[PDB]
Every structure is written in structure tokens, then in C-alpha cells.
Scaffold this active site. Structure first.
Site, PDB file in Angstrom:
ATOM      1  N   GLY A  23       9.456 -46.855 -12.382  1.00  0.00           N
ATOM      2  CA  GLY A  23       8.962 -46.888 -13.755  1.00  0.00           C
ATOM      3  C   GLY A  23       8.717 -45.517 -14.355  1.00  0.00           C
ATOM      4  O   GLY A  23       9.227 -44.508 -13.865  1.00  0.00           O
ATOM      5  N   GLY A  25       6.498 -42.197 -15.491  1.00  0.00           N
ATOM      6  CA  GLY A  25       5.379 -41.380 -15.040  1.00  0.00           C
ATOM      7  C   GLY A  25       4.884 -40.481 -16.159  1.00  0.00           C
ATOM      8  O   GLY A  25       5.406 -40.514 -17.274  1.00  0.00           O
ATOM      9  N   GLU A  26       3.874 -39.671 -15.862  1.00  0.00           N
ATOM     10  CA  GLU A  26       3.295 -38.783 -16.865  1.00  0.00           C
ATOM     11  C   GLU A  26       4.348 -37.860 -17.474  1.00  0.00           C
ATOM     12  O   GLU A  26       4.428 -37.721 -18.693  1.00  0.00           O
ATOM     13  CB  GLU A  26       2.159 -37.949 -16.263  1.00  0.00           C
ATOM     14  CG  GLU A  26       1.390 -37.122 -17.293  1.00  0.00           C
ATOM     15  CD  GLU A  26       0.255 -36.308 -16.692  1.00  0.00           C
ATOM     16  OE1 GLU A  26       0.016 -36.402 -15.468  1.00  0.00           O
ATOM     17  OE2 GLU A  26      -0.399 -35.568 -17.455  1.00  0.00           O
ATOM     18  N   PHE A  27       5.154 -37.229 -16.624  1.00  0.00           N
ATOM     19  CA  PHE A  27       6.104 -36.216 -17.087  1.00  0.00           C
ATOM     20  C   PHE A  27       7.558 -36.693 -17.151  1.00  0.00           C
ATOM     21  O   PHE A  27       8.438 -35.930 -17.548  1.00  0.00           O
ATOM     22  CB  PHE A  27       6.021 -34.982 -16.188  1.00  0.00           C
ATOM     23  CG  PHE A  27       4.706 -34.261 -16.268  1.00  0.00           C
ATOM     24  CD1 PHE A  27       4.485 -33.306 -17.250  1.00  0.00           C
ATOM     25  CD2 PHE A  27       3.691 -34.534 -15.359  1.00  0.00           C
ATOM     26  CE1 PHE A  27       3.273 -32.636 -17.329  1.00  0.00           C
ATOM     27  CE2 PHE A  27       2.475 -33.868 -15.431  1.00  0.00           C
ATOM     28  CZ  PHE A  27       2.266 -32.918 -16.417  1.00  0.00           C
ATOM     29  N   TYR A  96       8.061 -40.931   1.208  1.00  0.00           N
ATOM     30  CA  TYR A  96       8.099 -42.326   0.764  1.00  0.00           C
ATOM     31  C   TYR A  96       6.959 -43.113   1.408  1.00  0.00           C
ATOM     32  O   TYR A  96       6.744 -43.027   2.608  1.00  0.00           O
ATOM     33  CB  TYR A  96       9.440 -42.948   1.122  1.00  0.00           C
ATOM     34  CG  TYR A  96       9.553 -44.410   0.781  1.00  0.00           C
ATOM     35  CD1 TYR A  96       9.656 -44.828  -0.535  1.00  0.00           C
ATOM     36  CD2 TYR A  96       9.548 -45.375   1.778  1.00  0.00           C
ATOM     37  CE1 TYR A  96       9.759 -46.182  -0.851  1.00  0.00           C
ATOM     38  CE2 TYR A  96       9.650 -46.723   1.477  1.00  0.00           C
ATOM     39  CZ  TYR A  96       9.755 -47.114   0.166  1.00  0.00           C
ATOM     40  OH  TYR A  96       9.855 -48.458  -0.134  1.00  0.00           O
ATOM     41  N   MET A  97       6.245 -43.896   0.605  1.00  0.00           N
ATOM     42  CA  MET A  97       5.104 -44.682   1.083  1.00  0.00           C
ATOM     43  C   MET A  97       5.324 -46.120   0.636  1.00  0.00           C
ATOM     44  O   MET A  97       5.084 -46.467  -0.514  1.00  0.00           O
ATOM     45  CB  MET A  97       3.807 -44.106   0.516  1.00  0.00           C
ATOM     46  CG  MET A  97       3.584 -42.652   0.882  1.00  0.00           C
ATOM     47  SD  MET A  97       3.288 -42.361   2.658  1.00  0.00           S
ATOM     48  CE  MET A  97       1.582 -42.875   2.801  1.00  0.00           C
ATOM     49  N   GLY A 100       2.624 -48.248  -1.326  1.00  0.00           N
ATOM     50  CA  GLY A 100       2.111 -47.779  -2.604  1.00  0.00           C
ATOM     51  C   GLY A 100       0.659 -47.342  -2.601  1.00  0.00           C
ATOM     52  O   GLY A 100       0.132 -46.890  -1.577  1.00  0.00           O
ATOM     53  N   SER A 101       0.013 -47.469  -3.758  1.00  0.00           N
ATOM     54  CA  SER A 101      -1.386 -47.077  -3.910  1.00  0.00           C
ATOM     55  C   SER A 101      -2.289 -48.014  -3.112  1.00  0.00           C
ATOM     56  O   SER A 101      -2.045 -49.230  -3.035  1.00  0.00           O
ATOM     57  CB  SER A 101      -1.801 -47.073  -5.385  1.00  0.00           C
ATOM     58  OG  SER A 101      -1.186 -46.008  -6.096  1.00  0.00           O
ATOM     59  N   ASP A 141     -10.430 -35.572  -7.611  1.00  0.00           N
ATOM     60  CA  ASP A 141     -10.031 -36.912  -8.039  1.00  0.00           C
ATOM     61  C   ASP A 141      -9.700 -37.794  -6.827  1.00  0.00           C
ATOM     62  O   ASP A 141      -8.733 -38.565  -6.827  1.00  0.00           O
ATOM     63  CB  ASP A 141      -8.866 -36.850  -9.035  1.00  0.00           C
ATOM     64  CG  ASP A 141      -8.714 -38.129  -9.852  1.00  0.00           C
ATOM     65  OD1 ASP A 141      -9.702 -38.874 -10.005  1.00  0.00           O
ATOM     66  OD2 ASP A 141      -7.594 -38.389 -10.342  1.00  0.00           O
ATOM     67  N   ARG A 145      -6.977 -45.183  -5.729  1.00  0.00           N
ATOM     68  CA  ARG A 145      -5.720 -45.184  -6.488  1.00  0.00           C
ATOM     69  C   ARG A 145      -4.872 -43.941  -6.201  1.00  0.00           C
ATOM     70  O   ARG A 145      -3.668 -43.941  -6.460  1.00  0.00           O
ATOM     71  CB  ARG A 145      -5.980 -45.299  -7.993  1.00  0.00           C
ATOM     72  CG  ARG A 145      -6.738 -44.125  -8.573  1.00  0.00           C
ATOM     73  CD  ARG A 145      -7.031 -44.313 -10.050  1.00  0.00           C
ATOM     74  NE  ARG A 145      -7.608 -43.089 -10.603  1.00  0.00           N
ATOM     75  CZ  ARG A 145      -8.863 -42.694 -10.409  1.00  0.00           C
ATOM     76  NH1 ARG A 145      -9.703 -43.434  -9.701  1.00  0.00           N
ATOM     77  NH2 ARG A 145      -9.297 -41.557 -10.941  1.00  0.00           N
ATOM     78  N   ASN A 146      -5.498 -42.884  -5.680  1.00  0.00           N
ATOM     79  CA  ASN A 146      -4.806 -41.638  -5.348  1.00  0.00           C
ATOM     80  C   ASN A 146      -4.543 -41.478  -3.860  1.00  0.00           C
ATOM     81  O   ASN A 146      -4.191 -40.386  -3.398  1.00  0.00           O
ATOM     82  CB  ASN A 146      -5.582 -40.439  -5.899  1.00  0.00           C
ATOM     83  CG  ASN A 146      -5.530 -40.368  -7.406  1.00  0.00           C
ATOM     84  OD1 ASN A 146      -4.574 -40.831  -8.038  1.00  0.00           O
ATOM     85  ND2 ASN A 146      -6.554 -39.778  -7.998  1.00  0.00           N
ATOM     86  N   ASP A 159      -1.895 -36.986  -5.320  1.00  0.00           N
ATOM     87  CA  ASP A 159      -2.363 -36.521  -6.631  1.00  0.00           C
ATOM     88  C   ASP A 159      -2.909 -35.102  -6.608  1.00  0.00           C
ATOM     89  O   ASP A 159      -4.122 -34.872  -6.590  1.00  0.00           O
ATOM     90  CB  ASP A 159      -3.376 -37.478  -7.262  1.00  0.00           C
ATOM     91  CG  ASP A 159      -3.620 -37.176  -8.737  1.00  0.00           C
ATOM     92  OD1 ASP A 159      -4.496 -37.825  -9.341  1.00  0.00           O
ATOM     93  OD2 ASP A 159      -2.930 -36.291  -9.294  1.00  0.00           O
TER      94      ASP A 159
END
Length: 273
Positions: A23, A25-27, A96-97, A100-101, A141, A145-146, A159
């Protein structure tokens, strides 16, 4: 000690393939794929791209992540495989994870792991944080989630108000002890299977309640040793919080003596002290 080309490998784009677009992302875009290493080994990787028509600030901010991540080499810190800058789109390529989160993963598996599995996750996170703090890097942070989690349930820090220590909120006093506060919140998140810390309380009330001595309540069926560890991480006096090395040792002892986890705390409402 923590301080792009100095800490990040320039990858040959011919060694990178994309097989799934996750999907936005920020950048720019976020996807996964495969990386061919110099030894010809092939590994799965996460790939992040910089948007077409990026500004110079956007390029600096995006690649800045790699300049930080690349300084760390530890099993519980997301590994930087490298960057692509000599061709466009610009890329950051990381470990690669599969799962995910961590917060989202645990929400899908409410009450489905053993306490020892959860403690293993937590020990990994603590070990990664011990290394970051040894390097003098204050994350600021640290939150479930990170944290990313792989196919073998190994958790790794990523992050590079709800999670922030009272002194960091009050006057921006960020130290490794404010990261320990955050770790306590992550501990609560994990034992709660990804519930949101302080739910959707007004931010002003999260700040005030915590200042008054209120703390998140024990998660359901939480071992007493783990709720006490949360309370220790959440000491008002930052000098009274455990160091990350101590947290790792506490968790290692619980893993070594699993019977200790059978002592359950006594104890959406906060508890005073």
C-alpha cells in the site's frame, strides 16, 4: 555509539525484485519482494520507495531513516539491507517480517498465545532496546505498532502522548528512561493483545491521570510479575525505573522459572499507583 553511504549499502537494482504491493506509505509506496545478495543467496525483503516528484526535503527525510537504521546490527532491530539512490525510484530495503506490526497481529489472535510465547516476544523487544540505549539512541516512539514480528514470532524494533513518559510530555526530557516508560506501555499492549493504551481517553486526561499517579490496569490474567514490571517502568521518578539490561534479566528469569508466571495479579478504568 550512535551518531547515508557511511551506514547504508548502495544496492544494485538488478538484484531487487517486487512481487507484492502492500500500500501507500508516508513518502511513497510500500511493497515486498526479493533481494539477491552478492553471494547469490536470495532473501525476502521489505521495500519502500520515494514518490515520483519528491522534494529535496522529502528525499532527505526518507533516506534519513536509513542513515539511522544502518548504524544498528542486532537480531531484535530491523535490519537495513541497503538503499537504491543511483536510479529512481529511490528505495530503502529492509528485513521482511511476515507477520507485520505487533499490535495488529496480536489483535487478530486475542488470547491465543501462551504466556511464555508473549514473554519471548517481550524479551526480544527489550534486548533490541538494550542495544539502542547502549548506543545512546533514544527512540521516542517505542510502541507495539512500531514493533514488527516475523514468521517465528521474533519481534524487532522499527521506525527510525499515550506512549510518552510524564517528564517527556512536560518539558521534552527524552532519555533512555523515557524509552523504558514506553516499554512499559508496550508490555501492557502485548499482555492486552493489542488494546490501545488508555483506550480513547481525551489526551488532556491521559496527561493529568498519569501525573496524578493513575496507571493502566492489569490486563486480564496478567502474571503479577509482569504487572509489577509495568509499574516499575512507569515510576514517576525516572531514576527509579529499571534499565533495559535489568528488564532483559527480569524476563530471562521468568523464562527460566515459568512457574513464577502462574501467580496472577490481584487485580477500562485506571488504577491509582
Amino acid at each position: 555509539t550512535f551518531v547515508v553511504h557511511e551506514f547504508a549499502k548502495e544496492l544494485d537494482a538488478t538484484n531487487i525484485s517486487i512481487d507484492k504491493v502492500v500500500g501507500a506509505g508516508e513518502f511513497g509506496e510500500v511493497c515486498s519482494g526479493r533481494l539477491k545478495l552478492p553471494s547469490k543467496k536470495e532473501i525476502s525483503v521489505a521495500i519502500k520507495t520515494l514518490k515520483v516528484g519528491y522534494t529535496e526535503k522529502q528525499r532527505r527525510d526518507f533516506l534519513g531513516e536509513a542513515s539511522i537504521m544502518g548504524q544498528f546490527d542486532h537480531p531484535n532491530i530491523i535490519r537495513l539491507e541497503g538503499v537504491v539512490t543511483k536510479s529512481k525510484p529511490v528505495m530503502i530495503v529492509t528485513e521482511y517480517m511476515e507477520n507485520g506490526s505487533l499490535d495488529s497481529f496480536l489483535r487478530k489472535h486475542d488470547a491465543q498465545f501462551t504466556v511464555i510465547q508473549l514473554v519471548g516476544m517481550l524479551r526480544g523487544i527489550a534486548s533490541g532496546m538494550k542495544y539502542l540505549s547502549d548506543m545512546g539512541y533514544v527512540h521516542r516512539d517505542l510502541a507495539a505498532r512500531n514493533i514488527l514480528i516475523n514468521s517465528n514470532l521474533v519481534c524487532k524494533v522499527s521506525d527510525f502522548i499515550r506512549w510518552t513518559s510524564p517528564e517527556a510530555i512536560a518539558y521534552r526530557k527524552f532519555t533512555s528512561a523515557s524509552d523504558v516508560w514506553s516499554y512499559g506501555i508496550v508490555l501492557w499492549e502485548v499482555m492486552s493483545y493489542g488494546e490501545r493504551p488508555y483506550w480513547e481517553m481525551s489526551n488532556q486526561d491521559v496527561i493529568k491521570a498519569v501525573d496524578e499517579g493513575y496507571r493502566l490496569p492489569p490486563p486480564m490474567d496478567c502474571p503479577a510479575a509482569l504487572y509489577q514490571l509495568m509499574l516499575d517502568c512507569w515510576q514517576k521518578d525516572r531514576n527509579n525505573r529499571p534499565k533495559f539490561e535489568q528488564i532483559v534479566s527480569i524476563l530471562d528469569k521468568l523464562i527460566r522459572n515459568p512457574g513464577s508466571l502462574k501467580i496472577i495479579t490481584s487485580a477500562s478504568n485506571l488504577l491509582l499507583d
